[PDB]
Amino acid sequence: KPIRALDEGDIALLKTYGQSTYSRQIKQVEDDIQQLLKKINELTGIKESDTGLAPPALWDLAADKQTLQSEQPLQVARCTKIINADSEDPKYIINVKQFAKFVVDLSDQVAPTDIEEGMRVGVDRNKYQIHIPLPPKIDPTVTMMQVEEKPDVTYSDVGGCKEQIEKLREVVETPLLHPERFVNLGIEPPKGVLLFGPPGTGKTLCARAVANRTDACFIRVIGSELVQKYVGEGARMVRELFEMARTKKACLIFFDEIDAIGGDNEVQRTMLELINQLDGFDPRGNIKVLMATNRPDTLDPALMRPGRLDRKIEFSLPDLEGRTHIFKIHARSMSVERDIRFELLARLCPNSTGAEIRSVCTEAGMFAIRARRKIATEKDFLEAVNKVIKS
Amino acid sequence: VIMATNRIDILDSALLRPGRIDRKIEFPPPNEEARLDILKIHSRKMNLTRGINLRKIAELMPGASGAEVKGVCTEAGMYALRERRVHVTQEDFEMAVAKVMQKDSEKNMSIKKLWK
Amino acid sequence: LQSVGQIVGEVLKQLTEEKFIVKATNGPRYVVGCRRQLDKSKLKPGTRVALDMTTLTIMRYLPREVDPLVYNMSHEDPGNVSYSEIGGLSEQIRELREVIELPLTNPELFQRVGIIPPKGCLLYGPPGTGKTLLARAVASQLDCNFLKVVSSSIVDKYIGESARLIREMFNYARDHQPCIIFMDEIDAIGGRRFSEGTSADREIQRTLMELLNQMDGFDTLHRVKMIMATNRPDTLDPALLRP
Amino acid sequence: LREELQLLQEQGSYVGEVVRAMDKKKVLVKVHPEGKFVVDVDKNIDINDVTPNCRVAL
Amino acid sequence: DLRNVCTEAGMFAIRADHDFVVQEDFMKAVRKVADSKK
Amino acid sequence: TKGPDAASKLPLVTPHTQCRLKLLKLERIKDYLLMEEEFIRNQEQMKPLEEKQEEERSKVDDLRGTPMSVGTLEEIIDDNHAIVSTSVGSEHYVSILSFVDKDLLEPGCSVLLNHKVHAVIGVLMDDTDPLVTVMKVEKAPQETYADIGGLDNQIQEIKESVELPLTHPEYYEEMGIKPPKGVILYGPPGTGKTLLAKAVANQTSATFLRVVGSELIQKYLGDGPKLVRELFRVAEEHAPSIVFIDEIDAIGTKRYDSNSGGEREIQRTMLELLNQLDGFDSRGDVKVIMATNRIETLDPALIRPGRIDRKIEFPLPDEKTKKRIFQIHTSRMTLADDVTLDDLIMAKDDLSGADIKAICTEAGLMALRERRMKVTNEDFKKSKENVLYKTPEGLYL
Amino acid sequence: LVSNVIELLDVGKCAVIKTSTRQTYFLPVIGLVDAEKLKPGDLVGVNKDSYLILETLPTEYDSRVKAMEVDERPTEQYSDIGGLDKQIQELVEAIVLPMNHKEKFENLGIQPPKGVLMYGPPGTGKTLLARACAAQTKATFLKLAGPQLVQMFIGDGAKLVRDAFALAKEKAPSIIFIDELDAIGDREVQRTMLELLNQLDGFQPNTQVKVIAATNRVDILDPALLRSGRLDRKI
Amino acid sequence: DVLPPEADSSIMMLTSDQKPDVMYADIGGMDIQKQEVREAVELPLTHFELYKQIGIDPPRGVLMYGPPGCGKTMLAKAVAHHTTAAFIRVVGSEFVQKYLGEGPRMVRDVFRLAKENAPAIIFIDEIDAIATKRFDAQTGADREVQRILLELLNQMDGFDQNVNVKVIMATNRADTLDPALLRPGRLDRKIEFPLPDRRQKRLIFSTITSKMNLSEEVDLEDYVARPDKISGADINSICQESGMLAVRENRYIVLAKDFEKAYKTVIKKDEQEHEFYK
C-alpha cells in the first residue's frame, strides 16, 4: 500500500495528543542539565601542570647562567668503523640517530684509545668532534636483564620433567660442580645447549630452577626487549653482561624466548658478539650459555655448530605423573582440601601444557570464590578443568 | 549513513549487522510499470512523435535495469541523430531496445539441452 | 672547489614559457625557471633535471633514471661474439639477420619497398640450441644497445612490480635507441591467458598484457627489434603469438 | 598596497594543536613535525578561549 | 653438448698430461658426454 | 600515583514515565548544577591570589626562556648531564640545571628543554599526547547492567575479572590465586560485547580507557609502539584502571614473517603491546579487556594463559535471553495489549541483541506508518521479516 | 658528510649522490678524488656545505655479506676428514691443482674447470670437506645452503649470491660453496637455477674465486648446470 | 599564487608530439565501428548542439572488444590523432601498483585530471587486466585488484558525475568483464570488432598495399576471396612478409610467387593434430 509521508499537521499532532503532560518540562530540564554540565566543564579550569621546579634555595641561577653561556650540549651518536685510523686517520663515520652520518675527528681532550666502534659518543655542534665517549652504562633498573642472583624456584617447584631435568643435570651440574671428571677424562665441557619446546612447557622455569640449584645467578634476556627499543647497543649490553659474568663467580646465562633473536643486522652483530663470547671466550668458563626457543630450527645454523652448542634438549608436554605433580606443586600455594584427587585432574587434562594447568588451578580458585567459600572443593577443580581444558 | 553495493552477500557480517546497518533496502530490477515510468522520465527532453506507445517499449524489456532503459532512450536518440532528424519514432525505440539488450546466448544447443 | 653541487628533480609541467613545476626527489615541489641558454624544447614532463641549490633554477637536464635491475640487465657485456661461432643455422640466422639487422642498416630499403620495418621475432627450440648465442651474435654484429633478459627473472612477489619492470625495460629501450630486447624463456610470461583465477598466474596475465601494450600498443615503437626465445612455443598466448 | 607588501615580508606562522593550556601564561602545543613546545600567549589572545585540541598559530 | 665434448676432451688431455689432443681423446670425451646425456 | 577518573552524573531512571518523580529528580539535579555553577562563578569573581615568589620565579623563567621544548628523558648520566631525545627523535647530551627536581627525573618522563642550547629545565608528568587523552573516558556511557538482558554468566565473569579485584580483593590472596590480568570477550557480532564494555565503564571505579585497536597503528615509524607505551603508562599512572581494546583482531591477527616496513611496524606494535601486557604485574590494578568477533584469527600468544587467562564467550541469545532482551527494548514502548512477543522469540532464528533492538525499532517505525504509537502485534510481525533479510526445506525434517 | 653514490653519469663524468641526509645531489665535477673506480654505491665523504667528494672511504657492508662473517681459517689438515681419499685427491685435482698450474691450462689453450658437483647421503660430510679444501688452499671461504635458499622467497640470487661473488672478488682468493642438493608454484626455483647458470657464467673467467656445490642426491639433475663450466667435476 | 587545478598531476597527458600519426583513412574498413566510436567520442565534442537538440545524453564510454589484431588499439590511435579533446592514454596493467591503495589512487588521479581538463578522452587498453568479473577474493592482491575495479566504477558513474569525459576501453575478452562495468551509463556502447569478412578483407588489403609497390597483376581479390579466419593484423603481416620476401629475392615489385609464399607462411595453422580427435 502506498504509505503516506507524515504531513506537517501529522508531525504536529504526533508531537502532542499522545504525549505525557510532563514532556515539556522534563525535556527542557534535561537540556539545561546538559548545558550546565558543559558550562562547568568549560569554566572549571585546568590547574597549573606543576613543571619540575625544585624547592627554593636549591638553585644556583648564577652558575646556571655560567653553564648556559659556557657549557655546551653535545649530540650523541652511534660510532662506526674506525676508518683504520692509525693516528693519521682519526676520523670515524658516526650516526646521529635519524640524522645523517658524518666522518669526524676527535677533540684534544680525548684520546683514540678511549674511542672504539659501536659506542655512544657526545659530539659538538660546530665541528661534530667527538668530545666525550658516553658508555651506555649497565643497570638492572634499565633494560630487562638478569635481575636475579638466586632464583626462588628449586627442583621441588619443577615436576614432570624427570628425564628432562636429568639431561639438564648432565648438561650443567656435572661440569660446574664436578670439573675434575672432565679434566681427567680430557673432554671439553658442553659448550652450548638448546632447550627447544612448545610454549608454556616450562623451559624458562626449569632453567631458573637449575640456576637456583647450581649456585649460579640466573640471567633473563627477553628477546623482544632488544628487538624493540633497546636495539643497537644491545651488543655492548650483552658484552657487559658477559663481562660481569666474568667478574661474577658463576652466571647461568639464559636468553628468554630466543625465538625473538635467533629469528638481522644488529641481530647478527649481537650473535657474532656471542661468537666472540663463546668461541672467543674460553670454552672452560662457568658462565655456560642456555638456549631456549619456541621455534627450534629458527636459530642460525652458524650457532649450533660443534664447538658452539654441544646439546639440544626437547621439553615435551607433561605426562600423567607429570601432570599430577605440577597440579600438586601449583595447589600447594592454594587453599584447598586435603583429599583432592590430583590424579583425577591430571587424567582429565590430557596433552595439556603446564600453563594450562596453572590456569586450571587459578580457575578452580575462581570458582571457589564464586560461591564465596574459603576452601576449594574437588567439584571446583572439576568444573575448572571442564572450563579451561576443552577450551 | 548510506552505503551501496551490488554484492551484499560478500559484505562482512559485522558490517551488515543491524544497529550498524538497518533497513537493508533492495533495489530490484524495475517491473513493467516502473520501466514505463523510467522511460517517461528519460524521454522527457526528447522530441517524441505522435503515436509513440512507451508501454509497448517497456514491455519489450523483460528484466531490464533502469540504466538499460536510459541507454535505450539514448540509443533511440542516436538512431534519430544518424538520419539527421529530430523526432524519434516507435521503430527507433524498437531497434534501440534490440541493440541495448543484445547479449550473447548459449550458442551450443546441445549444452543448452542438458537440462529439461 | 668552486663548484657547489645541484639538486635533482623531475619536471612535472610547463606552466608557461619560463615557469616550470619541478619536484625535487624525496622532497618538496617548486615552480622554477630555467637557465638562459638551454633547450626548453627538450624539457618534457618527467625529464629528470638539476636545480641550483640556492636560486633553484633549471641548470641542466639529466638522462632518465634507470632501474637498478634494468641497469644490471643492460651493462652485461655480450663478449663481442662473432657470427662464425654459431655453426649450421645458415637459413635461420639469415632470416634473423634480415628481420632485425636490415631495419637497423638500411631502413630506406624497407620504406621504399612499402612495408613497416618488423617489430621483432621469436626463436623457439629445445634448450641448448643457440637462441641466446644467435641473439648475442646479432647484437654484437649490430654494435648496439643490448638488453639481455630472462622472463623468469622479472616475476615478483610484489603485486605490480613485474609489469612495472617491463615498463622500465621498454622505457630504457626507447631511451637508448637502437636497442635489442632479448627476453629469454618468454613462456614464463606469455604463457596463455585463462580465467582460473589463481593470484600468481593472474599477475602473469597482467604482466603479459603490459608486455603486449609496450610492444604493439598505443605508443608505436621506432627502432625499438626484440628477440624472444623459448622451449615451449605452443603454450604462448595467441595475442602474443599474433603478428 | 604598502601594508600588504610589509605584511608579506613577515614569516608564516606555524600551526599547532594545543595539548592543554598548562598555565595562564604557558600553553602546551604540538606542532607537526618540529615536536611539542610549551609556548606563551601574547597580549591579544586570552587563555580561557584556548581549548585543548584546537588549532593555533605560533 | 658438443661444446661440452670439446671442453671435456681438453679436460681429458691433462688426465694423461698432454699439451695437445688426440682422436681417441675426442672419442672417449663424446662417450662420457653421451653417458651424461643418458 | 594519582587516582582514577571517568566522573558520571546520576543514573536517574528511577522512574521513566515522566510522572513528575522524574521531574523532582531532574529538578534536584539541575538545581545542584546551578549551585555548582554559582559557587565556582562567585569563587572566580573573588579570588585574589598571585605573585608571591615572583622575582625568583621570574628569573627561573628567564633562565627557562621561551619557548621550552618538551623532550623524553631517555637516559641519565652523572647528576649534571643527561641524555634526552627530542620529539623529532634526535637525542642530545645536555646539562641538567640546578632548579630541576632530581627525584623526578626518571627514564620516560617528559622534560622541559631550553629552545637554544638544550638543557633539562623542567619536568612534565602530564604530557599525555592528545591521542591517549582522547582514548580516556570522561563522560561514562549511559548504559548499565540493568540495560543488559541475559548474559548473566558473562556479566558475572567480567565482574569477577574487572570489578572484584578493584573492590575487596582479600579473597584472591586468601585463596592464593592471582587476579586475572586481562579478559577477552568474543562471539558473533552484536551479541553484547561492546554493550558489556559500556556497562562495565558505567558501574566502574577505575580509569576506563577505550581503544579501537586499529587506533594504535600510526603512520610514522615508531609512533605505534610509542602510543601503546604511553597508553599503558597512563593506565599505570592513573591506577587502578581498565584498558578496553575493542576489535583486538585489528592488530591481534596471526604473527607472520614481515617483509614490508609497514608490516614490520605492525608486528612491532603488537610486540610492544604484548611486552607491555607482560610488564605490569597481575597483582597490579590495571586490567585489560579486549573484544573481537573472529576469535580464531587471533595470535595464540596474545591469548596465552600466562597473559590473558579468561575468555568470555558470547553465544547467540537463547529463548529466555531473547525474551529478557525483548522486555528490555520494549520497556519504553507503549505496546498494545494484543502483542504477545512470543511468536518472534519462538521463531528459530539467529536473532541477536542488536537484531532484537532493530526489530523493535522497525516495529515502532511501522506503527508510525499507520499514524499510531500503540504498536500492535502486526507491526512486530511485519518488522521481523523487514529486518531479517535473506538447509533446503525437507533435508532435515 | 658520508653519501652513497647512487650512480655516475657521463657529460667528463658527473655523479648523482644520495647523502645520509636523505637528499639527492648532482655534482658537475667529482670532488677532489679520482673518478675511475668510483663504484655506483661506493660510500664517500661529501662536503657538508658545498657537497663535493673530498675523499672515498671503504664500503661499509651489503646486508647479508656482513650477516655472514665469511670464515678464513676453517682449521682442517686433511687429517680431520677420513675415508674420502679418492674423493679428496679428486678435490685437489679439481680445484687447487688447476689453480697452481693455470699456466699449463693456458698452454693447452683451454679454460679451467669452474665448479664441482658433489653428492651423497644427507649426513655424508660434504661441508667439512669444503672446509678442508678452503684450509689447504688457504683461501677465503664463502658458503650457501640449499635449505636456506628454498625459503627467503625472491632474492636468493637477486641481491645475495651476486653480492657474495662481488665481495669474493674484493677479498680474494675465495671459494663459493653451495651445500645440500637444493631443488636443482615451483617457479621461484626456476629463477634460482636460472640466476645460477647466467651468473656462474656471467662473472670473471679467470675463476680466481672457485665454487663448490655439495648435493644430497643424483636424482634431480639440471643439464644446464651439471654441464661443463657450471659443475664439471663429479664427487 | 594559485596554480591550475591539477598542474602537479602524476599521470601525464598526450602531448602534441606524442600524438600518433594513424588517421581514419589508414583504417581499412570498420565503417560501423568507426561511426559508433565517433558518435560517442568525436561527435559530442564537436557537435554537442546535435545531441542537445534531440535532448539525449551522448554516449559516454565505449567498449571495443573482439579477437586480437582486429583494429581496437589502432582505432584508439586514430581517435587520439583525430581529436581536439584531452587524450589520456593508460593501459590496464599500469593501474595495478606495488603499494596498497596506490592503484585506486591512480584511477582517481587520471579521472580527476580528465575532469579538470577540457572535454577529455580516457583510453584504457587491455581493461581485462583489472576489470575481470568480481569474485570472492581471498587474498590481499585480488582484493586490491577488485578495489581498483570498484574505484573505476565509482569514478565512471558514481555520486559526482563527470561532464565531457568520454572513456574508451578495449579488451580481447569482453565476457570476462564485470557486469557492473558493462551496463549503460558506464560502457554505453560495447562495439564488437570481429575478424574481417570478405569485403572488410578487401578494404584492409587495399589500404595496406596502397603504400606498397605494385603487385604486377596479382589476384588480390582472389586472395581476399579465400575463406580464412584472419584478422587485420594477419593481413598487415602477409603484406609485410611479402615485402620481406621481395627484399630477400632482390626484386622491388612483388608478384604471386613471393606473395603466395608469404600467405602460406603467415597462416600456417598446421594442425599437427592426432586424427582421433577429428
Ligand SMILES: Nc1ncnc2c1ncn2[C@@H]1O[C@H](COP(=O)(O)OP(=O)(O)OP(=O)(O)O)[C@@H](O)[C@H]1O
Ligand atoms: N543481552 C542484551 N540485552 C540487551 N541489549 C542487547 C543485548 N545484547 C546486545 N544488545 C543490543 O545490541 C546492540 C549492539 O550490541 P553491541 O554494540 O554490544 O555489539 P557487539 O556484540 O559488541 O558486536 P560487535 O563488536 O561485533 O559490533 C546494543 O546497543 C544493545 O542494545
Ligand SMILES: Nc1ncnc2c1ncn2[C@@H]1O[C@H](COP(=O)(O)OP(=O)(O)O)[C@@H](O)[C@H]1O
Ligand atoms: N614441569 C613443570 N613443573 C612445574 N611447573 C610448570 C612445569 N611446566 C610448566 N609449569 C608452569 O608453567 C608456567 C609457565 O611456564 P614457562 O616456563 O613460562 O613456559 P616456557 O617454557 O614456555 O617459558 C609456570 O608458572 C609453571 O608453574
Ligand SMILES: Nc1ncnc2c1ncn2[C@@H]1O[C@H](COP(=O)(O)OP(=O)(O)O)[C@@H](O)[C@H]1O
Ligand atoms: N650452433 C650452435 N647451436 C647451439 N649452441 C651452440 C652453437 N654454437 C655454440 N653453442 C653453445 O651454446 C652455448 C650457449 O647456450 P645457447 O645454446 O646459446 O642458449 P639456448 O639454450 O637458449 O639455445 C654456448 O656455450 C655455446 O658453446
Ligand SMILES: Nc1ncnc2c1ncn2[C@@H]1O[C@H](COP(=O)(O)OP(=O)(O)O)[C@@H](O)[C@H]1O
Ligand atoms: N667422513 C666424515 N668426516 C667428518 N664428518 C662427516 C663425515 N661424514 C659425514 N660427516 C658429517 O656430516 C655433516 C655434513 O652434512 P651435509 O651432507 O653437508 O648436509 P647437507 O647435505 O644438508 O649439506 C657434517 O656435520 C659432518 O660432521
Ligand SMILES: Nc1ncnc2c1ncn2[C@@H]1O[C@H](COP(=O)(O)OP(=O)(O)O)[C@@H](O)[C@H]1O
Ligand atoms: N582495418 C585495418 N586496416 C589496416 N590495418 C589493420 C587493420 N586492422 C588491423 N590492422 C593491423 O593490425 C594492427 C592492429 O592491432 P590492434 O588490432 O590494434 O591490436 P589489439 O586488437 O590487440 O588492440 C596494426 O598494426 C595494423 O597494421
Ligand SMILES: [Mg+2]
Ligand atoms: Mg560490538
Ligand SMILES: [Mg+2]
Ligand atoms: Mg591492442
